[PDB]
Amino acid sequence: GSQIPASEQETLVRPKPLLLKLLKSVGAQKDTYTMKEVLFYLGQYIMTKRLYDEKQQHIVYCSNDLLGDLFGVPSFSVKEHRKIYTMIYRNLVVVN
Amino acid sequence: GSQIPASEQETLVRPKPLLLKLLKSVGAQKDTYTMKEVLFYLGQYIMTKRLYDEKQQHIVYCSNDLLGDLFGVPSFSVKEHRKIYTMIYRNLVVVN
Numbered sequence: 001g002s003q004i005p006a007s008e009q010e011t012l013v014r015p016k017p018l019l020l021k022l023l024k025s026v027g028a029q030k031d032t033y034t035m036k037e038v039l040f041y042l043g044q045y046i047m048t049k050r051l052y053d054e055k056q057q058h059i060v061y062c063s064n065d066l067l068g069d070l071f072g073v074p075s076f077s078v079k080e081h082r083k084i085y086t087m088i089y090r091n092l093v094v095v096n
Numbered sequence: 097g098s099q100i101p102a103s104e105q106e107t108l109v110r111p112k113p114l115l116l117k118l119l120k121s122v123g124a125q126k127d128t129y130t131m132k133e134v135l136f137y138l139g140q141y142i143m144t145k146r147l148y149d150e151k152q153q154h155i156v157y158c159s160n161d162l163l164g165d166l167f168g169v170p171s172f173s174v175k176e177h178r179k180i181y182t183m184i185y186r187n188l189v190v191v192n
């Protein structure tokens with residue numbers, strides 16, 4: 001989360017089928033996570049498939065990728081935390 | 097429009113306050129347009145403010161532009177025709 005209220009970073013959530021598959025494919029193994037954990041695994045993911053741009057590393061390109069289907073965009077910046085979060089929020093259910 | 101029938105491109109619409117200002121900001125001067133015209137002005141806007149990705153030209157990076165707020169995305173592909181129509185529709189009222 002970095003600059004997302006730490007309180008919000010610990011928010012307990014249940015990823016929907018598509019996001020859950022993304023997570024487990026990189027090593028995750030629960031059905032319930034904290035936002036901070038999702039970001040972490042989503043972080044490994046980006047890193048392993050190298051969805052980042054070599055010369056412009058803070059920009060991710062997920063056009064022809066499963067991530068692109070979850071987020072619904074061809075690219076985003078890892079510097080804009082609030083936007084990534086809301087993009088992640090649509091692929092899960094917040095456990096109350 | 098494209099991938100979208102001509103019957104749909106000619107649909108009559110009334111942009112909402114923000115999209116309207118957006119349109120008039122690039123030379124438009126009506127309060128009601130056809131989808132085809134909105135796309136055209138929106139095309140000039142994108143081009144005029146150089147919002148296209150230099151190395152992935154089919155991607156409109158509108159993250160830090162008012163266009164980002166209206167479309168609700170940090171970016172989008174000009175190949176996703178139906179998605180663009182949807183984003184535009186949310187910003188207007190179809191003149192019945």
Ligand SMILES: O=C(O)[C@H](c1ccc(Cl)cc1)N1C(=O)c2cc(I)ccc2NC(=O)[C@@H]1c1ccc(Cl)cc1
Binds near residue numbers: 039040057058060
């Ligand atoms: O570790 C961080 O603090 C940072 C981060 C950036 C934005 C947000 Cl919302 C949370 C965390 N982050 C990265 O900088 C990062 C960037 C790339 I390019 C690749 C991996 C990576 N690793 C991270 O753990 C996160 C991160 C992971 C997934 C996503 Cl979608 C965004 C950022």
Ligand SMILES: O=C(O)[C@H](c1ccc(Cl)cc1)N1C(=O)c2cc(I)ccc2NC(=O)[C@@H]1c1ccc(Cl)cc1
Binds near residue numbers: 138139143154181
């Ligand atoms: O001219 C077209 O047929 C095409 C177009 C693409 C998608 C849709 Cl839905 C309608 C029209 N189009 C562009 O390819 C385009 C691309 C860029 I990058 C910049 C301008 C541009 N000009 C256009 O007239 C359109 C277009 C304009 C605005 C938007 Cl939001 C999307 C496409």
